[PDB]
């Protein structure tokens, strides 16, 4: 039988730095080749209609930071950085469920040496280094973008509402008090080996427990979605988004960010770049920071009330 193998098993002492340098230079050139999508052969750009839904991104949660507004209040922001985002493939409206067209979007770059063969074939046909995570965005087909294009962080604007979704922090096989917020039994008034138990789990007539019963079990490694997060500020040099409040998942995981689906923010996308912000044809480079009109900037006259 065939034994296992890895990439550098049979490589020499001198060939390992050469292969690292070679493949690093190749996927750096591949990332730099897709830099100007508007000069290649772009798919037709449409104007915004009111019943439209555009694509999102995949960002990497750096950390948190405080952030002050002109009334004096303090808000906390999560810095989501868009590391290397690329539209991968497009599936038309009649080819998934007959409801809405889909777009695939890839996350940050990882090594070719640690993916399956069909995935490497897919990225070799597409022309990009392989991505860590791949999310599927429901869009309407007047917002379709060409596969292989770059998506940036100025896709979103300061003053908007996004919905971020990631895997929450996994806490292992957790007992019922930390998981479901049950109370326990009291501590010292006679209790025998029952300080954190679930107690009764059903009634006596039924002879079973219901399927929806709350019991101990693995807690916290599940996709959750944080709804209605305001984006306060966009940094365009490092491609960092500043969403309001907390975001599910640990730091340096990958989150999926798209604009809100709440009814209050149904059609606020008329002032947003629609197909996606293209930094080529803008004819005016954006500033290094795009602020909402409420946030105190770092260069500020140190607000005085009156």
């Amino acid at each position: 039988g065939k034994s296992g193998t890895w990439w550098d098993e049979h490589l020499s002492e001198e060939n390992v730095p050469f292969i690292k340098q070679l493949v690093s230079d190749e996927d750096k050139a591949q990332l730099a080749s897709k830099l100007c999508p508007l000069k290649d052969e772009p798919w037709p750009i449409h104007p915004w209609e009111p019943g439209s839904f555009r694509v999102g991104l995949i960002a990497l949660k750096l950390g948190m930071m405080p952030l002050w507004t002109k009334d004096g209040q303090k808000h906390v922001v999560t810095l989501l950085q868009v590391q290397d985002c690329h539209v991968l493939k497009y599936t038309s409206k009649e080819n998934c469920n007959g409801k809405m067209a889909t777009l695939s979007v890839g996350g940050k770059t990882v090594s070719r040496f640690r993916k399956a063969t069909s995935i490497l074939e897919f990225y070799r046909e597409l022309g990009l280094p392989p991505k860590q995570t791949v999310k599927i965005f429901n869009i309407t087909d007047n917002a379709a973008i060409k596969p292989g294009t770059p998506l940036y962080a100025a896709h979103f604007r300061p003053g908007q509402y996004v919905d971020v979704t990631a895997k929450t922090i996994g806490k292992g096989f957790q007992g019922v008090m930390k998981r479901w917020g049950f109370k326990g039994q009291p501590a010292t008034h006679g209790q025998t080996k029952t300080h954190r138990r679930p107690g009764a789990v059903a009634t006596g007539d039924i002879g079973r427990v219901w399927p929806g019963t709350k019991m101990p079990g693995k807690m916290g490694n599940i996709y959750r979605t944080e709804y209605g997060l305001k984006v306060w500020r966009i940094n365009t040099k490092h491609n960092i988004i500043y969403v309001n409040g907390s975001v599910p998942g640990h730091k340096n995981c990958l989150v999926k960010v798209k604009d809100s689906k709440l009814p209050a923010y149904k059609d606020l996308g008329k002032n947003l770049p629609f197909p996606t912000y293209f930094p080529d044809g803008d004819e005016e480079e954006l500033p290094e920071d795009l602020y909402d009109e409420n946030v105190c900037q770092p260069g500020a006259p140190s607000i005085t009330f009156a």
């Binding site: 049979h10 490589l11 020499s12 002492e13 001198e14 060939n15 050469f18 070679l22 806490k171 292992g172």
Partner: protein, 152 residues
């Protein structure tokens, strides 16, 4: 839940863990090669490298002398550390304490390992060598390397 929680719990407490690592480290400084279970030599290797850093801080430094007086439990290894081990690595920065797996203990079937200081007048370990350059794959990659060298 032990997210981001280094330092294994080894003995019967924190203090017994420090004493276990101290005995393993004193054996390492005396004999320059040790076999012990894998978790213990992992922890003791992390301690041994910074012990060599304290030895390289100098002999007249009172803090380095205090640390060598605590961590070395035989008191003859302190002149050895400050006059043999630290002058041996006067050029290097951090590459010492080579650790390798040896198969299993006989009785309780533990994962054992060997760590040694470099230098090491003892006979050398049977290290696994990376594959030779004259093989088929490496000659193909050498042809590719020479071709993209001449193309530049």
């Amino acid at each position: 839940i032990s997210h981001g929680r280094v330092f294994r719990r080894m003995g019967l407490g924190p203090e017994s863990r420090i004493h276990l690592l101290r005995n393993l480290l004193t054996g390492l400084v005396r004999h320059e090669r040790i076999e012990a279970p894998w978790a213990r030599v992992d922890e003791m290797r992390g301690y041994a490298e910074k012990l060599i850093d304290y030895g390289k801080l100098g002999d007249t430094n009172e803090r380095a002398m205090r640390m060598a007086d605590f961590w070395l439990t035989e008191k003859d290894l302190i002149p050895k550390l400050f006059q043999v081990l630290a002058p041996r690595y006067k050029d290097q920065t951090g590459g010492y304490t080579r650790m390798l797996q040896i198969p299993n203990r006989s009785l309780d079937r533990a994962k054992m390992a060997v760590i040694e200081y470099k230098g090491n007048c003892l006979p050398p370990l049977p290290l696994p060598r990376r594959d030779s350059h004259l093989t088929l794959l490496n000659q193909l990659l050498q042809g590719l390397r020479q071709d993209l060298r001449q193309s530049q």
